[PDB]
Amino acid sequence: GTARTVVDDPQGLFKKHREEELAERRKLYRWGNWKDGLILNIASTGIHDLPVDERFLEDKRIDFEASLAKGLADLAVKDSLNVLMSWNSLDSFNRIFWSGQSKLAERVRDSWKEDALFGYQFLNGTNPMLLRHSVELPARLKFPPGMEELQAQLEKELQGGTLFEADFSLLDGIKANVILSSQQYLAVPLVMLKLQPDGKLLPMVIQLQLPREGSPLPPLFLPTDPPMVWLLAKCWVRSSDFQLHELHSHLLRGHLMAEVIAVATMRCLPSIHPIFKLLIPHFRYTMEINVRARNGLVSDLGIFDQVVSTGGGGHVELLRRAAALLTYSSFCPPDDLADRGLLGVESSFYAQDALRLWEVISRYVEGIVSLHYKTDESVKEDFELQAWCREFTEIGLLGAQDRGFPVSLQSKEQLCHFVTMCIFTCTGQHSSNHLGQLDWYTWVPNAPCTMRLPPPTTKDATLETVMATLPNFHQASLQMSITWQLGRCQPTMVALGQHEEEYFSGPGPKAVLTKFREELAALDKDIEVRNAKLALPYEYLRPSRVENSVAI
Ligand SMILES: CCCCCCCCCCC#CCOCc1ccc(CCC(=O)O)cc1
Ligand SMILES: [Fe+2]
Ligand SMILES: [K+]
């Protein structure tokens, strides 16, 4: 039917039906709280408890299960051969790098030791969310004696506007896992990088640990250190990026935020509501995938506990600390990118595509909003909308109005912005953090799920040190299995905009959708043409690859 807000219905012709639907919604979709301090989730002990309309269809259920089975059968074969052999060379990781890898993963296996490939991933790799433009040297970067030349190169880049940083201080104080009684280890690194005129982003220095007042300074690793020393330092930043990417950029910001959006929407916006109709398709499978994740991925004795250095509880502590710090602006590429100083960096394909995708969605949302809300007053008086943002910000996000989340929507502009934030969260925000796994994480030394020795406090690493720190064959194989499972071409995916159900009636909304689809296709083509000229195509925000919801 035609959508109708409560403002559209002063005689209450649809009041009883919408009120009855919301009362049933609020019984079926209740808030749960998997861990103290985390943003809230759907209340459901496991997948069998979920409302029926949230369950995987058969095709998705078969796909998700069978793909685990295949990943686990491959892990069994890998492990059965590797126990019979030595594991004493970086070439040992070849033995687990089976056929069927993506073209980009084959490039990573070839080039992972290149400093330019290490730096490239901060712009356009699996985790584009951490890098920030530097306007001063961080207070933690303290120089041991003899490093005057480093200090001058850092000053030249800073004066030229070309100094960037990746600071992993969220890992400070996080407890590391113990796996089959062997201690795992975490670092708390900082990497300073230079942006070159040709677009390359090069690491200048790495510090692995925070200085401690009563202690000698951490060493500063440099690209001129002995090859294994600098390699080990880089591996440690890569292992640290795996932890903050998967937990903060991917789980919290993609998956868990999309679930908060979904639950608050189910609880407050009835099916006759235009903004329900606009949002719905973008929630597909989010609650079941997350329930599955809480019961097998990040659960006690789950994947993280089995193979990941933050596993065993530290991962939950990091989630609660990151949850307390989320800001609204960080979910909106125009604000996030300005704030991090990535706007205008021609080498950031993530920035260029994120901003364009945000605009195309913004136009679609504005289209639908203007069909149903003629004035700012018609937004202000929509009490379902007002209940909606409050439930989202106050209950779902544990009181986040001081971090920029809305508790009222008082204009069409505001409504459009917030809806746009919601749709981008469920789509591009996830795709850009999820799709890299297949290309960058299947070559395990490029993103070690764990580390088995403490980070070095000297410059004497050998290959033996590197092999003994890097994941063992089992940990590395399970990493490959799950990253393939999640990362691989999704046979049941719905691409952005391509949902088949018609929530809206009428030519009005149909025309806005047709235009969204046309603009998305034109953007996809423009990225495809840019990518044909690049050494490494940036694929993760192309509309043809961006999924319509968080489903995996
Ligand atoms: C060694 C770990 C490699 C993979 C790390 C991936 C972390 C992903 C973080 C964000 C997310 C999510 C949704 O989670 C998907 C999910 C759910 C259940 C399971 C366990 C059973 C199975 O693999 O089928 C794995 C993955
Ligand atoms: Fe995901
Ligand atoms: K209206």
Q: Which fold has domain 137-221?
A: Nuclear Transport Factor 2; Chain: A, (3.10.450)
Is 367:512 a contact under the CB 8 Å cutoff? Answer: yes
Query: Best mutation site among 437, 486, 488 for ligand 1, i.e. most ligand atoms within 8 A of its Cβ?
Result: 486
Cα 296 to ligand 1 centroid, rounded to whole Å: 8
Q: Which two tokens stand for residue 342?
A: 């990535």
Ligand 1 nearest atom to the CA of residue 308, by list position = 1
The angle that helices 115-124 and 349-372 make with each other, rounded to 10 degrees, is: 10
Known binding residues for Fe cation: 250, 255, 430, 434, 552
CATH superfamily of 1-136+222-552: Lipoxygenase-1; Domain 5 (1.20.245.10)
CA angle 288, 293, 296 (to 5 degrees): 120
Domain ranges of the chain: 1-136+222-552, 137-221
Cα 432 to ligand 2 centroid, rounded to whole Å: 10
Q: Which is nearest to 348 in space by CA: 119, 78, 72? A: 119
Is 455:185 a contact under the CB 8 Å cutoff? Answer: yes
CA angle 320, 285, 435 (to 5 degrees): 70
SS3 495: strand
**Residues of 426-459 as b/e, b for ≥16 C-beta within 10 angstroms?**
bbbbbbbbbbbbbbbbbbbbbbbbbbbbbbbeeb
Query: Best mutation site among 177, 257, 287, 303 for ligand 1, i.e. most ligand atoms within 8 A of its Cβ?
Result: 303
Is 241:441 a contact under the CB 8 Å cutoff? Answer: no
Q: Where would I find the beta strands (DSSP E) of 208-282?
A: 220-221
Beta bridge partners of 479: none
Q: Is 479 in the pocket of ligand 1 (CB under 6 A)?
A: yes
Q: Is 70 in the pocket of ligand 1 (CB under 6 A)?
A: no
Q: Is 322 in the pocket of ligand 1 (CB under 6 A)?
A: no
Determine the Cα–Cα distance for residues 419 and 374; give it in Å rounded to an integer: 17
Resolution of the deposited coordinates, in angstroms?
A: 1.9
Determine the Cα–Cα distance for residues 257 and 396; give it in Å rounded to an integer: 9
**What residue owns the CA closest to ligand 1's atom 25?**
297
Relative to the alpha carbon of 378, which ligand is closest? 3
Relative to the alpha carbon of 9, which ligand is closest? 3
**What residue owns the CA closest to ligand 1's atom 11?**
251
Cα 485 to ligand 1 centroid, rounded to whole Å: 8
Is 489:552 a contact under the CB 8 Å cutoff? Answer: no
Q: Which amino acid is at 317?
A: E
Q: Is 308 in the pocket of ligand 1 (CB under 6 A)?
A: yes
Q: Which two tokens stand for residue 43?
A: 């209340």
**From the DSSP assignment, how many helices (H) and strands (E) are in the chain?**
21, 9
**What residue owns the CA closest to ligand 1's atom 9?**
251
Q: Is 247 in the pocket of ligand 1 (CB under 6 A)?
A: no
CA angle 348, 328, 246 (to 5 degrees): 60
**Residue 338 φ/ψ, nearest 5 degrees:** -70, -45
Ligand 1 nearest atom to the CA of residue 254, by list position = 10
* Method by which the coordinates were obtained: X-ray
Longest Cα–Cα distance of the chain, Å, equals: 80
**What residue owns the CA closest to ligand 1's atom 21?**
296
